[PDB]
Design a protein around this ligand. Structure first.
Ligand SMILES: [Zn+2]
Ligand SMILES: [Zn+2]
Lengths: 388, 380
């Protein structure tokens, strides 16, 4: 039985996303606590000492910066190279489907002065795992994120680079390192012990025509090798005050970063996560499953940053959160389609291998919980509201 | 003093490209020798036990297939995986500038069932080295080719893969295998010493162009094989195969300087590459395409001659302006290197003037304001 929907009284987020005694999410408390307790000058000195520790004296890379060429990864790599005198190799786990602006931003990243190693996993395997994750979990990104989180550490192992810097805030407030990942390497020995897109590796090979090579790209970094090679993952948001709007204007100035030419569906923003077309369906699934769409996440980030008030947040959520993303829907349906030509085995496992709109909407219904949705000739039972 | 231009009597190529006693290029004789002496069934058997030797059982990659997702690299990876039961990692040294169809073909490659590791070198460094190679050698691809040739062996070392298979004919006919003072080493006609000294580069900027460590190659038993040794390589076959199995997309329009639509269509700078070879050697893209098709038996020397006469001297206008911008070394992106150039921002007039400085009078004669070739290939 699911929890009754309550909204946080600082941001516009709900308790459904996968609160304290004043009804405030941990996220608002961490942001507000950081906006008093953090001395950014002494964090700047810690960054300069970390760079001194790792900076390469020869012509080798001293730094791995993962990212898609979005405003955050652009800021991270650009400030590490041209302000802290680092030599980052940039590395990209490929999106499902490049947006035009997303591809231009990836190129602008490279053309700001960076080598880039882009890994694009087997497109057939990726589509099958994405379709399975949509069918089983209504979570297209589930397999993708397993590969993404593994990629940068594995790339540091391959190029024998020790330092990995993510252009985002730390996972644990106060700690610039993350290290938990070892539990991913164990998850194994058995058939139905490991899972991918809500399907066991055993049944992927058994029934969907996959082999162990098709899954090599998704395996986590070997923790023995990580420890052995002294690979350290750092979060640049620990060391530098991370402000998305600042990263946008910085990336426009120094890189020619291009915002989405039109408003991102489901939200009001134009420069948050704009490289992957399937991003649209990701926020539709979370909306369907948890009653909170993309405008909720964007407005919550902007309320904590101090760029908007909770009242403007509530107005934006009300206007945009329930918008369906039509622009790429048809390409995405084709991407999710498991045809006989490309998938001689896997295609037969699906009742409707070729996805259309009606099938996707029917599938969405099966993830729409009646404690969040009531029909109107659908509508949220509970929308975020302004404070009393 | 340069050699007087003679054309080969089998194909339509000249002796200027960087002949025997019947006036036949070595390339025509080697194609003739191959279409007689080669038992392709026995070459197929040799391929099957190259594959047996290297095939991986533990679900790791057992081979590296380099390429851009053009018809050849598509064929190589697709036939190795789906016919010879290999598990290739595909590997791409990025082009200067993706064509739209080129990028869609690279994606079609990945979506035919291949993991791909794409290396895109520092775009500023690449533009500066390409502009230098254009100024000094009239050879935009020179630094690109150094990096490209190094890439696949280095990738085999990184992923700890032993077998590298190029989707092309062998370099040496008959064998399928390939075998401190900064003012000594050169890149785009410029020494490493002067690149760092005067153009604002460091050792890291040039790391991507360094060759594979030969000690590491020998130690890890990395073998480069050429698939054209083992399989009868026919460009047009690779095209129709790649269309059938991958949705390979030809150029929507005829490639400038030639008649073809699916030979090397991924890099916009490919246009200027064939213009420079024409300017320096009197032979453009139609000469290379027609010569290949004459040896394959698909056209006669006379059709070749007609195609060279109509297409070889075409200037590639479609991407000219984007390429001039690509070669432009502005102050924002190159605060140091920009000042080294008399005209940092390239335009058409500067490119044409620079071309003139490479147009040798033993190959080109003026006719009013139109350059014409002193010697064009003839039917004979
Ligand atoms: Zn909150
Ligand atoms: Zn010849």
């Amino acid at each position: 039985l699911p929890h009754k929907v309550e909204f946080c009284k600082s941001c516009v987020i709900s308790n459904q996303r996968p609160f304290d005694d004043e009804g405030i999410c941990d996220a608002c408390r961490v942001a507000e606590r950081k906006k008093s307790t953090i001395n950014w000058e002494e964090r700047d000195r810690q960054l300069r000492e970390l760079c001194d520790r790792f900076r390469s004296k020869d012509g080798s890379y001293d730094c791995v910066v993962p990212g898609s060429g979005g405003k955050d990864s652009f800021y991270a790599a650009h400030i590490l190279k041209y302000k802290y005198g680092m030599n980052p190799l940039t590395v990209t786990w490929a999106p499902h489907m490049y947006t035009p602006w997303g591809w231009r931003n990836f190129q602008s990243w490279i053309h700001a002065g960076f080598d880039n190693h882009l890994f694009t996993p087997n497109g057939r395997v990726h589509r099958l795992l994405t379709r399975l994750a949509v069918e089983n979990l209504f979570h297209p990104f589930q397999p993708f994120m397993i590969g993404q989180k593994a990629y940068a550490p594995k790339m540091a192992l391959l190029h024998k680079i020790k330092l990995v810097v993510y252009g985002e805030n730390e996972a644990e407030y106060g700690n610039p390192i993350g290290d938990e990942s070892a539990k991913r390497d164990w998850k194994a020995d058995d058939k139905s012990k490991i899972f991918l897109g809500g399907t066991s590796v055993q049944e992927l090979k058994s029934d969907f025509g996959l082999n162990d090579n098709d899954l090599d790209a998704y395996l986590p970094a070997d923790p023995q090798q990580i420890e052995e090679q002294q690979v350290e993952v750092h979060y640049l948001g620990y060391y530098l005050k991370w402000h998305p709007q600042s990263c946008y204007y910085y990336s426009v100035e120094h890189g020619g970063f291009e915002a989405s030419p039109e408003r991102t569906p489901g939200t009001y923003s134009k420069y948050n996560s704009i490289d992957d077309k399937i991003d649209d369906f990701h926020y539709y699934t979370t909306l369907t499953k948890f009653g909170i769409g993309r405008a909720t996440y964007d407005a919550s980030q902007e309320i904590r940053s101090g760029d908007i008030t909770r009242e403007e947040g509530v107005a934006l959520v009300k206007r945009f959160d329930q918008e369906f993303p039509e622009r790429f829907a048809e390409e995405i349906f084709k991407y999710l389609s498991i045809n006989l030509k490309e998938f001689p085995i896997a295609s037969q496992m699906f009742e409707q291998p070729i996805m259309d709109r009606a099938y996707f909407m029917a599938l969405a219904d099966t993830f729409r919980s009646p404690h969040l949705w009531k029909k109107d000739g659908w509508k949220l039972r509970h929308q975020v509201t302004n404070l009393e």
